[PDB]
């Protein structure tokens, strides 16, 4: 979604229509969509200040463009009102970007027209700077939450060989409050499930026969609990390993499992609670970033137009919505229409008129 | 890159910038003059009124 | 700016570079040297032709300084 922003010297009033309405001469013979660009009438002093401003604005432009695209990607990562294949951008001014740009207005609320450009630029720069820091910090904190939540999901992921037992083991799975006995959980591949049941009773001296049962099963193995004499556990786990059974390092612990369950429940709720305010925060920041973005471009237009054509500052600036495969024709038309003013001052960027691209 | 007509145009443009700059500078000068008017008037009159009050 | 010593190697582009920085806000001074002097860097005698712009703006004067430094031009007239 690319739009072209241009400005003509405006010597004659026909320029208002030549850039829009003159089907005989206008864009793709009046096939490209164009609209009026609303610009404030601001004060200029000497040409060197304008030169400074031009440099400053080019830098501010690049900065904000980066910031607004970054935050757009942040929301893409959030997956709310903007995706990479659909919903390519967010609303600006409460309208879609296509609508915003097409009916783009100067935000005099933020940039009073009675101020000098230096101050206007400084004000915008400060706004977008604050927005950048606010959302960078917020996004980082959110990403850290997402990180920890995924970390817990992974911790509670996997098969019985590695999966956390918080959701598997019950108090009724362990032999508790025994003086001599401990209950161990061992994973026996399902192919050898009966062998475990047959073999566990004879793996070590002084084990409790017929005590073996199954706590859980998965596609590869069964997790079984066995109660045994504490001192035989070394022989039990040793010989179990010899018969290719894997014992888990687990003992019943109500507090750790409860803590894990609530921590996951809390982090998921926290994710939802931040999401709520996340999308409102980021969408507002986007809106403002996009508004400022175009405001910056408008100022770049003002500065270049005045710098090249002099004052009074009456120029005919217009927006185009290029049509597919007509870029060449539009450039040829614009060149023939305006080449006589510069002949050589303005490939990669230099045209005989004020020209910027909008990358959407 | 310029014909005589365009050289003249470029000069007219510079002259325009010269005029705009001078106009702005003078306006700034008069505004500051008025601020200084009120500030110095205050300094002086308050200073001597104080001296008078002390003598009084 | 100054009627210096240039072979008119990049002056055709010097002027355009100036137009690129600002729209030719000030006229340039032109000169041509008959039987030019032997350029010290060249070590031999080449025709010299000068087209240099003077600016009143400081940002742009500094810009021109940088261009003149980068381009094959003679600039240090007082």
Contact A264, A152 (CB under 8 A): yes
| Chains contacting C (3 or more CB pairs within 8 Å) | A, B
How far, in Å, CA of A166 to CA of A254, rounded? 9
Whether CATH 3.40.50.300 fits A39-161+252-312: no
**Closest CA–CA distance from residue A303 to any residue of chain B (Å):** 14
How far, in Å, CA of C15 to CA of C29, rounded? 11
3-state helix, strand and coil shares in percent for chain C, rounded to the nearest 5: 30, 20, 50
Q: Tokens for A263?
A: 């921590």
Q: Tokens for A29?
A: 């013979």
Q: Tokens for B21?
A: 């700059």
The alpha carbon of A98 is separated from its chain's Cα centroid by a whole number of angstroms, namely 21
The resolution in Å comes to 3.9
Q: Encode chain A in three state secondary structure.
A: CEEEEEEECCCCCCHHHHCCCCCCCCCCCCCCEEEECCCCCCECCCHHHHHHHHHHHHHHHHHHHHHHHHHHHHHHHHCCCCCCCCCCCCCECCECHHHHHHCCCCCCCCCCCCCEHHHHHHHHHHHHHHHHHHHHHHHHHHHHHHHHHHHHHHHCCCCCCCCCCCCCCCHHHCCCCCCCEEEEEEEEEHHHHHHHHHHHHHCCCCECCCCCEEEEECCCEEEEEEEEEHHHHHHHHHHHHHCCCEECCCCCCHHHHHHHHHHHHHHHHHHHHHHHHHHHHHHHHHHHHHHHHHHHHHHHHHHHHHHHHCCCCCCEEEEEECCCCCHHHHHHHHHHHHHHHHCCCCCCCCCCCEEEEEEC
* Residue A89 DSSP symbol: S
Task: For domain A162-251, give the fold.
Answer: Alpha-Beta Plaits (3.30.70)
Domain boundaries along the sequence of chain A? 1-38+313-360, 39-161+252-312, 162-251
Closest residue by Cα to residue A81 from A90, A72, A93: A90
How far, in Å, CA of A248 to CA of A188, rounded? 11
Q: Tokens for A306?
A: 């005045």
How far, in Å, CA of A45 to CA of A115, rounded? 12
- Cβ contact (<8 Å) for A45 and B16? no
Determine the residue of chain C that is closest to A306 in CA distance: C23
Sign of the CA dihedral running C37, C40, C45, C47: negative
Contact B21, A46 (CB under 8 A): yes
* Residue A227 DSSP symbol: E
Q: Which residues of A207-219 are buried (b: 16+ CB within 10 A; e: fewer)?
A: bbeeebeebbeee
CB < 8 Å to B10, chain C: 23-27
Contact A230, A183 (CB under 8 A): no
Taking residue A324's Cβ as centre, other Cβ atoms within 10 Å add up to 5
- Cβ contact (<8 Å) for B17 and A343? no
Contact A267, A152 (CB under 8 A): yes
How far, in Å, CA of A7 to CA of A9, rounded? 7
Structural method? cryo-EM
How far, in Å, CA of A12 to CA of A337, rounded? 13
Contact A307, B17 (CB under 8 A): no
No. of helices (H) and no. of strands (E), chain A = 8, 8
Closest residue by Cα to residue A190 from A219, A213, A167: A219
Residue A357 sits at φ, ψ, to 5 deg, of: -105, 150
Q: Which residues of A22-45 are buried (b: 16+ CB within 10 A; e: fewer)?
A: beeebbeeeebbbbebebbebebb
CB < 8 Å to C57, chain A: 46-48, 51
Among partner residues A46, A310, A344, which is closest to B21 by beta-carbon distance?
A46
* Residue A352 DSSP symbol: S
Determine the residue of chain A that is closest to C23 in CA distance: A308
Residue A356 sits at φ, ψ, to 5 deg, of: -135, 155
| Chains contacting B (3 or more CB pairs within 8 Å) | A, C
Sign of the CA dihedral running A107, A113, A117, A121: negative
**Closest CA–CA distance from residue C11 to any residue of chain A (Å):** 13
| Chains contacting A (3 or more CB pairs within 8 Å) | B, C
How far, in Å, CA of A324 to CA of B18, rounded? 45
Determine the residue of chain B that is closest to C15 in CA distance: B1
CB < 8 Å to B11, chain C: 26-27
Measured torsion, CA atoms of residues A154, A259, A178, A208, in degrees rounded to the nearest 10: -20
- Cβ contact (<8 Å) for C63 and A51? yes
Task: Please check whether residue B14 touches C, CB under 8 A.
Answer: yes
CB < 8 Å to A117, chain B: none
Closest residue by Cα to residue C24 from C32, C14, C15, C13: C15
Reduced to 3 states (helix: H, G, I; strand: E, B; else coil), residue A85 is coil
Closest residue by Cα to residue A46 from C56, B26, B8, C61: C56
Among partner residues B1, B13, B24, which is closest to A310 by beta-carbon distance?
B13
């Amino acid at each position: 979604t690319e739009f072209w922003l241009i400005s003509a010297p405006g010597e004659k009033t026909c320029q208002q229509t030549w850039e829009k309405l003159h089907a005989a001469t206008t864009k793709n013979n009046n096939l490209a969509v164009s609209s009026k660009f609303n610009i404030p009438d601001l004060k200029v002093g000497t040409l060197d200040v304008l030169v400074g401003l031009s440099d400053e604005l080019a830098k501010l432009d690049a900065f904000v463009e980066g910031v607004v695209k970054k935050v757009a990607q942040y929301m893409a990562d959030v997956l709310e009102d903007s995706k990479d294949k659909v919903q390519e951008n967010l609303l600006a001014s409460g309208v879609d970007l296509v609508t915003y740009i097409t009916r783009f207005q100067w935000d005099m609320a933020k940039y009073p027209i009675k101020q000098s450009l230096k101050n206007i630029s400084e004000i915008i720069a400060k706004g977008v700077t604050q927005i950048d820091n606010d959302l960078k910090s917020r996004a980082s904190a959110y990403n850290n939450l997402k990180g920890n939540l995924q970390n817990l999901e992974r911790k509670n992921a996997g098969s019985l060989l590695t999966r956390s037992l918080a959701e598997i083991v019950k108090k009724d799975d362990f032999v508790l409050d025994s003086e001599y006995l401990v209950t161990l959980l061992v994973v026996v591949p399902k192919l050898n499930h009966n062998d475990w049941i047959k073999q566990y009773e004879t793996l070590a001296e002084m084990v409790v026969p017929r005590s073996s049962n199954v706590l859980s099963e998965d596609q590869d193995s069964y997790l079984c609990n066995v109660t045994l004499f504490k001192k035989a556990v070394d022989d039990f786990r040793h010989k179990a390993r010899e018969n290719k059974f894997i014992v888990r390092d687990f003992q019943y612990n109500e507090e750790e499992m409860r803590a894990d369950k609530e921590e996951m429940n809390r982090l998921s709720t926290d994710k939802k609670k931040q999401f709520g305010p996340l999308v409102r925060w980021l969408k507002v920041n986007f809106s403002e970033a996009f508004i400022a973005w175009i405001h910056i471009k408008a100022l770049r237009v003002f500065v270049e137009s005045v710098l090249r054509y002099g004052l009074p500052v009456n120029f005919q600036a217009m927006l185009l919505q290029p049509n597919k495969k007509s870029v060449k024709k539009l450039r040829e038309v614009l060149h023939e229409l305006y080449k006589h003013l510069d002949s050589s001052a303005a490939q990669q960027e230099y045209y005989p008129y004020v020209y910027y691209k909008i990358d959407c | 890159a310029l014909s005589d007509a365009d050289v003249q145009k470029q000069i007219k443009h510079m002259m325009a910038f010269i005029e705009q700059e001078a106009n702005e500078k003078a306006e700034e000068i008069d505004a500051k003059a008025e601020e200084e008017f009120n500030i110095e008037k205050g300094r002086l009159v308050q200073t001597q009124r104080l001296k008078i009050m002390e003598y009084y | 700016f100054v009627a210096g010593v240039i072979n008119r190697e990049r002056i055709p582009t010097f002027e355009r570079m100036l137009w690129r920085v600002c729209r030719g806000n000030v006229f340039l001074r032109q000169a041509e040297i008959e039987n030019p002097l032997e350029d010290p860097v060249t070590g031999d005698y080449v025709h010299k032709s000068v087209f240099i712009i003077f600016f009143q703006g400081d940002q742009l004067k500094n810009r021109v300084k940088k261009i003149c430094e980068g381009f094959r031009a003679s600039l240090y007239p007082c």
